[PDB]
Amino acid sequence: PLTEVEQKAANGVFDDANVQNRTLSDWDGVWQSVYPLLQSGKLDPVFQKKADADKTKTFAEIKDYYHKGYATDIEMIGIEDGIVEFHRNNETTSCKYDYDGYKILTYKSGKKGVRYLFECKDPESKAPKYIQFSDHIIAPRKSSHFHIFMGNDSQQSLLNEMENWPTYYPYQLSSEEVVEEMMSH
Ligand SMILES: [Zn+2]
Numbered sequence: 349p350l351t352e353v354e355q356k357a358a359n360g361v362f363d364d365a366n367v368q369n370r371t372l373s374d375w376d377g378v379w380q381s382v383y384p385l386l387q388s389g390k391l392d393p394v395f396q397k398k399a400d401a402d403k404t405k406t407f408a409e410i411k412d413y414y415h416k417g418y419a420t421d422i423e424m425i426g427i428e429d430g431i432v433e434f435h436r437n438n439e440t441t442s443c444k445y446d447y448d449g450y451k452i453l454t455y456k457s458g459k460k461g462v463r464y465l466f467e468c469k470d471p472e473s474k475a476p477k478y479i480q481f482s483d484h485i486i487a488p489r490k491s492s493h494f495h496i497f498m499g500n501d502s503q504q505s506l507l508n509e510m511e512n513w514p515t516y517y518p519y520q521l522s523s524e525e526v527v528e529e530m531m532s533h
Pocket residue numbers: 364452
């Protein structure tokens with residue numbers, strides 16, 4: 349239903365006074381890394397239509413951007429009931445994360461983002477200690493796909509990465525369904 353104002357927001361325009369707190373369950377769902385769709389060339393039409401409206405960019409450099417961009421080996425995230433399970437190699441880790449606010453970011457492009465931060469306070473879980481969802485939303489609302497940044501250093505390091513953003517769409521969707529979305533977008 350996306351409003352028109354929620355849309356200048358997704359594009360990185362918003363007043364820092366409009367961001368609001370979100371909860372872990374904006375991101376409940378079972379979810380699939382779109383990386384394998386990069387790798388089998390399933391996403392090219394996206395990177396195509398994009399070099400078609402960017403004269404600074406060739407199909408080549410765009411693809412290379414999303415390659416470095418989506419690379420993860422967390423194949424699959426499942427989030428539900430306060431817990432986040434990561435699937436890397438026929439083995440999950442999970443942890444009951446705790447909301448720890450949001451950082452507002454301004455990118456080198458003058459453009460802005462909000463990372464909604466969480467942390468694992470479980471001594472006994474083996475999940476990443478620090479996670480940050482960023483999903484182009486600034487206020488409570490169910491995600492449609494998201495970037496998650498994850499690490500065990502601090503929050504600030506993650507805040508520092510602009511290089512990698514493993515990107516997740518819902519498991520329901522077909523490859524055909526995923527690309528469709530990244531165009532109508
Ligand atoms: Zn501020």
